[PDB]
Design a binder for these strands. Structure first.
Length: 144
DNA sequence: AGCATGCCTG
DNA sequence: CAGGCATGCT
């Protein structure tokens, strides 16, 4: 297969539970069924850029509504795991907290007025990827 | 140019 | 999510 099928995406979204900034080097490894090339690679990578934005958009929101002043998972889980195909790995539940803690810190400190202030947060989150489970390489995984 | 990042759009 | 565009390095 040379093209990313709609399952490849359903799959990619799941991986996001373990990795926010996967290296293209690693992405390939988890898609042995795909013969990459400038395009599909660019595309797969774009997917994650997209997964990240939605994610941070959600983080900054919850963080802000909180400052002023859970089910937020329904949101995140709906977005990346629509049919609850797998169980949300605990690491993810911690990455989330880490992320929310950072935004809350930044916002509450008004340090959110500076341009590209989210950047700091990003560098921090980028070191939190975890190794994506081995069975994600399994041809049989894509099925189910 | 030719491929990668990133922001931001619809 | 895919398109566009501005950008930065080669």
């Amino acid at each position: 297969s040379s093209t990313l099928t709609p399952m490849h995406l359903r799959k990619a979204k799941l991986m996001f539970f373990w990795v926010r900034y996967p290296s293209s080097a690693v992405l390939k490894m988890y898609f042995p069924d795909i013969k990459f090339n400038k395009n599909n690679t660019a595309q797969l990578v774009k997917w994650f850029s997209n997964f990240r934005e939605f994610y941070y958009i959600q983080m900054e929101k919850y963080a802000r509504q909180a400052v002023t002043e859970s089910e937020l998972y329904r949101v995140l889980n709906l977005h990346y795991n629509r049919n609850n195909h797998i169980e949300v790995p605990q690491n993810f539940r911690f990455v989330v907290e880490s992320t929310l803690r950072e935004f809350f810190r930044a916002i509450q400190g008004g340090k959110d007025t500076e341009q590209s202030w989210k950047k700091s947060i990003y560098k921090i989150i980028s070191r939190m990827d975890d190794p994506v489970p081995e069975y994600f390489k399994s041809p049989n995984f894509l099925e189910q």
